[PDB]
Amino acid sequence: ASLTEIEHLVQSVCKSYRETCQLRLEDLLRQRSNIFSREEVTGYQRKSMWEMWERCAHHLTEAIQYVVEFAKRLSGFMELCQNDQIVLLKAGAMEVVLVRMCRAYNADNRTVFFEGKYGGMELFRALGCSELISSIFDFSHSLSALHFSEDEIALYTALVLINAHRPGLQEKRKVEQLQYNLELAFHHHLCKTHRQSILAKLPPKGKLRSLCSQHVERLQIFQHLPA
């Protein structure tokens, strides 16, 4: 690879994400002024667990379609065989949607954006799974502390999808090579922006799989939808 070409690689990842980011950043930041009234929360709490479950299931799949919408935008994704394309998304999709959640988390009052307005965690009392609902807010809270620049989330997300150290990829060396160019464009931009300091600050391995695996595991037990 070439240096001038790697900088090109960064511009694609940053753009492919900004066009497949679901919600605009300028929207979440400015519309953060209003939140659910205590009335509106009890209405969400009164909802049957199936009610709230049907909600997240849609918003989750919808947020994932943008995740896969992101993958097909990367400049080197299409070349590799379909199987590797399927595997990377299966294990990376749910984790990519987690990193994108902190981007909608307001660390000031612990309120995430869910259906046209910010709200706390008591909004999901109908579900009745505290430790799982809180594992996301606390995680996004830490990630929201670093004050992720949009370009970083795009770069970080790319390395979440790409991962040759995945279950059953076929032509892995095509995944290893690309997984490295992204890390190159990642570190280069970090140093190029004086934010190489975060590398020792991010979640290891690790928290992405363990946190999602707990959710993905509860659905493989109780559900029948996509699984």
Ligand SMILES: C[C@@H](NC(=O)c1cc(-c2sc(C(=O)N[C@H]3C[C@H](C(=O)O)C3)nc2CC2CCCCC2)cc(C2(C)CC2)c1)C(F)(F)F
């Ligand atoms: C099974 C288990 N977990 C999930 O169902 C689940 C839901 C979501 C998503 S994605 C999403 C969106 O895209 N919201 C956008 C679209 C909305 C809009 O258009 O306004 C805002 N909303 C949600 C629902 C929110 C529920 C409260 C905790 C934050 C997540 C994300 C995930 C990941 C990424 C962890 C794996 C898991 C469960 F907790 F459900 F039991």
